[PDB]
Design a binder for this molecule. Structure first.
Ligand SMILES: [Mn+2]
Ligand SMILES: [Mn+2]
Ligand SMILES: [Mn+2]
Ligand SMILES: [Mn+2]
Lengths: 745, 745
DNA sequence: TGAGGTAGTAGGTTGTA
DNA sequence: TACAACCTACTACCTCAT
DNA sequence: TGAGGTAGTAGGTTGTA
DNA sequence: TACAACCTACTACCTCAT
């Protein structure tokens, strides 16, 4: 089979126990808590003594050479205590930080073209390289004509074991930056009203957008009684305004919104935010060109990290610590156990389907009882386009036809829909006010001959005249009518395509229509392990200080949705309260007992993120009820990438490819081709349970492949994935009694 | 008529412009913001210089005598600038703080019984008196045998006009305190496991409850490596542990829960929280005895504040400023305009009702269409008690009978209910687990012959075996069946009463049953002013970091509920977002157009609290739609009390009694007899609108008197009152389409 | 919002304590 | 205050080919 | 949770900036 | 950090008397 490896390079030779200088931080201020100042004391002693290595154990600072005890800090009186050779066996993380410091100090001395520094070193795990290794294996500055920089952004994490052997865990991202601030764009004369920007002279994390450009110069005394240059000199920041010339004083004052009031900054201090949108708006050719540079398959990630490690080389102050430029041939050397999980068997109306598109030839597994009467909203200037769109949808669903012809790929009577262009209604709506959208949706429910809406909304782009998706879905949630919304662009694809491109649009639209009416296209034939129901718990954070409700979804062992429970009250944080856990799991056991006749003997709880809930509550709750339960932490955001090494040839791994060490597991659930990036695996760890992680990973990978809303699988299992979809459609939850209908899909 | 006055005493003579010493606070720390340290600098310069008057203007400190510039503070370098006689016309608040300082300094020198200080002065607006003026006009220490103190808690607010004349606005509350800490209760030997306590050695505001009492002494070195006395000496707080004796070192360590982890305090530092519950549990006779001392009618409040002002007397450092000991005979001298608002005319089935209890003789105004089938849950050991309870409810509602006899006060066929003890179901439920409560409610909806539930729940007290209200109301909200819950004690009142006491129980239960099925008992005959709909906006805060959704209720001009809108997403703060305002008021105009055929020409928005929303949004939204709108800020919590002075005789004001100065208005909406306290008026101000405040106050007082869930009126208007009731029943909102049924009631 | 993925940009929450 | 793991939101790009 | 009020205890959020 | 107006939660007490 294909071996699996991670982005890791083995260190040649070990590190020795070396002399450290233990320092003490005490709470010199009005407080006495040193834990709230330990990292600040580390950073100030590192920065105030020409960037020399300072490390952190629980209350102490450790240093590789003799530095004077600093009383100059007002918050931290760092003082020498003793001189101790720390052993490797008790100080793994400290020697990991030592190795990453010496990697940083070795890479600071590396140059490109003999003049330019290659790496931007701040002596951290994060390393920005000013140049990029290209696909043709050449270090090149990726700049544009408009000053946009692309920088390869490395993240090192060396791990030292008890013997001193070092394993350099690596990853690489991209970094969008620019050297042109707003002063240079005003010297050039660019439209800067409304740009999302950041201030390089403050560390405050907040959305900064430009209101306008005032004609007042920065040297003129402002509305606060003093000028802005005087305002920067009074803030003990006169060194930033010291190098300003007379032409710099002729800069126009650019006021900037800081989400509470109008801030007043100078245009030299503010730098624009280089998103994909800004980069595409200003220089679209450069944003085309870096598409193969930011979306890196595992071979080009290996070549990038190989060039990085060749730039590291030998480290003469760690007993000649050099790193290999090859990945491990297997992760068994790293403790992981690798493999591939077998594909789920998906059942249809005619039996096993080999692909998800064969469900439109075989027919869906469960059609809901009853006839589905359509209704259609569409904007008024898009009439015949919407005619052709609903014509294509109905010919796909009922009459089994694509482009008017009966197709071998499509079965007749996929969904028992009822749409007659004489009988069914086409209510057109004028684009415009939001209350007119809401009244148009209420007007379409004025006629009781509509059981499902195929409303055509404008594009999610085109920031002009308001989108009707949000008012339509809110009103149809208030009215408990399901609805599949469609952009104007998708309707124009249905009107204007002659190839089979719109067929896949039709596949996903009809799977949406089916899931929203309680139908099921495919089911699992058999789930691995002894499980009765799946619960996917999640708490999402919409904004600052706003949390989504602790959404749960309930599945059976075959992965069809029994239930979802949105608690009506929000909570304080990402931990679910035991009262909310009471609500959720009483709803779980009630729904499983309603559809099955008894309590579930086995529950697997897929907690999205960390299972920070009280485990003693869970043990009491399911031990009083004779329920064996399992808590699996399914985690989305993880910088770890899995490769497939095959006689030294790095490639993207297939879906179902996992690595497993202990309870932590990284599993690839997406099959992503080269020149489209590399697959982001799911970090999966078991916080509680007694099922082995092979069963848990097989169940999670089975739950990824049974996403009933698309013909291609979800990256997340639909426990945590449908919890995310309900957190997205949280203002769109239908009013009436909770059932199998998947509104969020 | 009866004059209205406020708790205010006029000052005899004026204050002169006096010499101030303007000081400067600069941001000496790593920050430069002086507004975040101005009050701390005021307090430290006040405390570090033997409690001398320090005042705050926007960035400056003002002082009445020459104090040295203090550089000892690490955060504030307070420095003298200039010496200026501030004029009265520009510095109203500063001279108000001067007068309140000199009142504090005059009252510090006042003694009771020649030995004991009367007042506890911290030189603020708040003044605790150690003694109480009793009802018999005698200064007496209100102590108990268990160390519980009652203290009269004054709040002064002198107001100086431009001429220097001073008006002492006053109020008085009570203060529950004790002198016995947990060290003295352990020396006495009291049960202290589980007590809600506070630490007198920290200013952190949080719930502190005792987990247990450890046998470890406080002198023994703890689990942190150091003892607790060493922990207080290391925190620069060795003066608190300096006076401890050997018997103090034999105190047991009392660990205390601080909502995140176990804190470890000594029992001398922790003081128990003296609530009404703790006071009633320990010394119930003293809590009986102070009922007429904390709930003070306006005459006893006048006598208390009169004794307070007689203790103030003449102030020789404010040009002999003495205060009167009489209220104003009218608030026209204070700028207010007083009066009484006419009573609302309540219409019934037979016409105008003079009292709300005549609606049970005349019949209700609107019965809903259809027959209402009861269903009853009750706990199993309370069977015949629940038989008699539902017997009394059905004899009141349908057969018009009280205690089995046809009553002249009760009309036959009040509500078209259907309850046959042979046909209707009595599902009994075992008290116990919450999931058994939820399954009992689902079992009562297993039979489809129930349209309303009269479920009998256990008491809200009796912290033993779990209350079933919350699971029942959650499940019946999931099932869209309305339900009137009843305690076991109320059912025992229906079973065991022979007088007309349970008749009022029956009145409020049947008004609840009527409002929850969409019926309306009474309506307004005519509303004052040109208004089409009332909107009551509110955002509630359940806990720290948790906000209730921005609930709105919609009324017509006659005060019957058109609509309520709970947004599905929570928000960050008490300001309603303009997207949420879009949702709310589109729902408002849609509901008024659905029940009336057009948009409302006039809207009055009763915002509970502050109308902190964007007024430009409102003006744009209702100006594009040709709607004149009004925003009234109806405010619950206000220390201001209105009196009725009648030839110098102070008494409680009637309901509908208002005072009005400008846009701010205080209106008494509750008719509260003497020896039951004094009425808390509603602070009401118009943030936007063009209706006069007499119309706004008449509409608010009309909206108080049409609370359809009780035979006695609500203090709040049912705009803000029903917004509060939906915020309380926020996890109890029924699933199906929003209608006239008042679930929250 | 056809669906799903990769990618950056930005902002959080919590635990480490 | 501060990073490490986790999140969320938004936007490009890219593809979909029994 | 019959309903409503007054009362304390406690904890917030925001604006003042 | 800090008070001033506003809130919320909880608990006692008290009453209800056409
Ligand atoms: Mn989520
Ligand atoms: Mn969808
Ligand atoms: Mn409220
Ligand atoms: Mn009620």
């Amino acid at each position: 089979v294909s071996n699996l490896t991670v982005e890791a390079f083995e260190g040649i030779g070990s590190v020795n126990p070396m002399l450290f200088y233990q320092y003490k931080v005490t709470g010199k201020g009005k407080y006495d808590n040193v834990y709230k100042i330990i990292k600040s004391a580390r950073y100030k002693m590192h920065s105030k003594n020409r960037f020399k290595p300072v490390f952190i154990k629980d209350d102490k600072l450790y240093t590789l050479e003799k530095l004077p005890d600093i009383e100059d800090l007002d918050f931290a009186n760092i003082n020498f205590v003793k001189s101790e050779v720390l052993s490797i066996e008790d100080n793994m993380s400290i020697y990991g930080e030592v190795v990453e410091y010496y990697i940083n100090l070795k890479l600071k001395k590396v140059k490109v073209l003999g003049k330019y520094p290659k790496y931007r070193i701040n002596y951290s795990k994060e390393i920005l390289s000013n140049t990029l290794l290209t696909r043709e294996l050449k270090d090149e500055f990726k700049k544009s004509n408009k000053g946009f920089n692309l920088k390869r952004k490395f993240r090192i994490s060396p791990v030292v074991n008890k013997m001193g052997k070092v394993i350099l865990y690596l990853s690489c991202s991209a970094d969008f930056s620019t050297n042109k601030n707003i002063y240079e764009m005003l010297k050039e004369g660019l439209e800067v009203e409304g740009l999302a920007v950041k201030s390089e002279w403050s560390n405050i994390s907040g959305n900064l957008v430009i209101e306008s450009v005032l004609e007042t110069k920065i040297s003129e005394p402002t509305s606060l009684g003093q000028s802005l240059i005087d305002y920067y000199k009074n803030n003990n920041q006169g060194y930033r305004v010291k190098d300003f010339t007379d032409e710099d004083l002729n800069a126009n004052i650019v006021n900037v919104r800081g989400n509470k009031k109008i801030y007043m900054y100078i245009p030299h201090a503010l730098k624009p935010i280089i998103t994909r949108e800004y980069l595409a708006k200003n220089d679209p050719e450069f944003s085309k060109e870096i598409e193969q540079l930011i979306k890196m398959n595992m071979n080009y990630r290996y070549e990038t990290l190989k060039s990085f490690v060749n730039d590291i080389g030998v480290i003469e102050e760690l007993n000649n610590l050099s790193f290999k430029n090859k990945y491990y041939e297997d992760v068994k050397l790293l403790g992981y156990s690798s493999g591939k999980i077998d594909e789920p068997v998906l059942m249809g109306a005619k039996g096993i389907i080999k692909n998800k598109m064969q469900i439109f030839s075989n027919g869906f597994y469960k059609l809901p009882e009853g006839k589905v009467r359509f209704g259609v909203l569409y904007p008024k200037e898009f009439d015949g386009v919407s005619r052709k769109a609903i014509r294509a949808i109905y010919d796909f669903s009922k009459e089994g036809k694509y482009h008017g012809e009966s197709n071998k790929y499509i079965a007749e009577h996929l969904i028992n829909v009822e749409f007659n262009p004489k009988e069914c209604i086409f209510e057109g709506y004028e684009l415009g006010d939001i209350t007119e959208y809401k009244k148009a949706a209420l007007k379409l429910n004025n006629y009781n001959n509509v059981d499902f809406v195929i409303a055509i909304v404008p594009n999610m782009s085109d920031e002009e005249i308001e989108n009707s998706y949000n008012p339509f879905k809110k009103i149809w949630a208030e009215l408990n009518l399901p609805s599949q919304m469609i952009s104007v662009k998708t309707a124009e694809i249905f009107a204007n395509s002659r190839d089979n491109t719109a067929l896949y649009y039709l596949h996903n639209i009809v799977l949406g229509i089916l899931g929203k009416i309680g139908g099921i296209p495919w089911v699992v034939k058999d789930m691995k392990g002894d499980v009765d129901c799946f619960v996917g718990l999640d708490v999402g954070t919409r904004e600052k200080g706003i949390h989504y409700p602790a959404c749960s979804v309930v599945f059976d062992k075959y992965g069809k949705l029994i239930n979802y429970y949105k608690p009506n009250i929000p909570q304080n944080g990402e931990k679910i309260n035991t009262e909310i856990l009471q609500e959720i799991f009483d709803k779980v056991l009630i729904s499983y007992e309603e559809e099955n006749g008894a309590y579930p003997k086995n529950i697997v709880i897929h907690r999205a993120g960390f299972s920070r809930e009280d485990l003693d509550w869970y043990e009491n709750y399911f031990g009083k009820k004779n329920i064996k339960f399992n808590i699996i932490e399914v985690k989305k955001s993880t910088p770890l990438k899995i490769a497939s090494i095959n006689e030294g040839n790095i490639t993207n791994p297939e879906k179902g490819s996992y690595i497993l060490r202990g309870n932590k597991a990284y599993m690839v659930t997406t099959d992503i081709k080269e020149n489209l990036g590399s697959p982001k695996p799911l970090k999966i760890e078991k916080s509680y349970g007694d099922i082995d992680m092979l069963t848990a990973l097989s169940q999670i990978y089975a739950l990824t492949q049974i996403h009933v809303g698309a013909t291609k699988s979800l990256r997340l299992p639909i426990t945590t994935g449908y919890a995310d979809k309900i957190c997205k459609a949280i203002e769109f939850i239908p009013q009436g009694r909770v059932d199998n209908r998947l509104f969020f899909l």
